[PDB]
Amino acid sequence: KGEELFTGVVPILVELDGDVNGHKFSVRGEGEGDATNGKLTLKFICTTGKLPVPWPTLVTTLVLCFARYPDHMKQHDFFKSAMPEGYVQERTISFKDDGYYKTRAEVKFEGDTLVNRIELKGIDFKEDGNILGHKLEYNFNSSNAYITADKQKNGIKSNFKIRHNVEDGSVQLADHYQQNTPIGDGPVLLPDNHYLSTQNALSKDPNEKRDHMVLLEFVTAAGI
């Protein structure tokens, strides 16, 4: 019955509180998702002035319930099945030759709004490296991530890689480890192995003086 909450377009609220090497910050984002088409459009603002890390490093942390699951895979959509009570999403993101993020989020409906509320801690970063030194290009690469059931925890897990282009032509690796567990006691769908394919486009608002990110995302589930 959770899948029936996602017909049409659903408003989204994202709130992130972060601390990276003691540099604290907050992000607020709002937008909407169209699960039928797997389409997300959001705009994010740093509410604490200047974001101390590059915007592309926060894309994955900043709502997989909006993935388009094909009809023959609808029995493998854990994310919608956990709604409206929601799920916890936890990650470790390790930046090669630099520090790492630890994130804990709750994704659930609050009224008619799908909310993603996140806490982030970043540790062991180089003050002069690619992240705290703001040396990453303002763009994003397409990505694929394998999803497997975590039958004991009644949830799912995923390990996948993100590649961030660096201003010197090199590529900054961000290795993601993910696990999701339902918040509620109700039954949920545990999936067979599959993958989620994501396409991203970042842009800026021409008349926006705040530090911000405009994001368009397509997410699609696929079989092998």
Residue 46's H or E segment, with its range, is strand 39-46
* H-run or E-run covering 79: helix 78-81
Q: What is the stated resolution of the deposited model, in angstroms? A: 2.0
Cα–Cα dist 19/112, whole Å: 30
* Torsion angle (degrees, nearest 10) of CA 22, 204, 113, 14: -10
Q: Distance (Å, rounded) from C-alpha 38 to C-alpha 70?
A: 10
Helix (H, G, I), strand (E, B) or coil at 30: strand
Other beta carbons less than 10 A from residue 166's beta carbon: 13
**What is each CA distance from 70 to 6, 143, 158, 179, 205, in whole angstroms?**
14, 18, 20, 22, 33
Task: Say how far apart CA 49 and CA 65 lie, in whole Å.
Answer: 30
d(C-alpha 96, C-alpha 208), whole Å: 33
CA distance linking residue 145 with residue 99, whole number of Å: 22
Rounded-to-integer distance, Cα 143 and Cα 126, Å: 26
Residue 182, preceding peptide bond in cis (omega within 30° of 0): no
Measure the CA–CA gap between 66 and 33, rounded to whole angstroms. 6
C-alpha to C-alpha distances, 220 to 36, 113, 223, nearest whole angstrom = 10, 22, 10
Strand, coil or helix: what is 61?
Answer: coil
Q: Which CATH superfamily is domain 2-222 in?
A: Green fluorescent protein (2.40.155.10)
Side chain identity, residue 42 = L
Question: Which DSSP state fits 174?
Answer: E
Distance CA 66, CA 34 (A): 6
Q: What is the largest CA-CA distance in the chain?
A: 50
β-strand pairing of 10-20 with 113-123: parallel
Distances (CA, A) of 178 to 11, 36, 77, 141, 220: 25, 24, 16, 19, 18
- Cα 6 from Cα 66, distance rounded (Å): 8
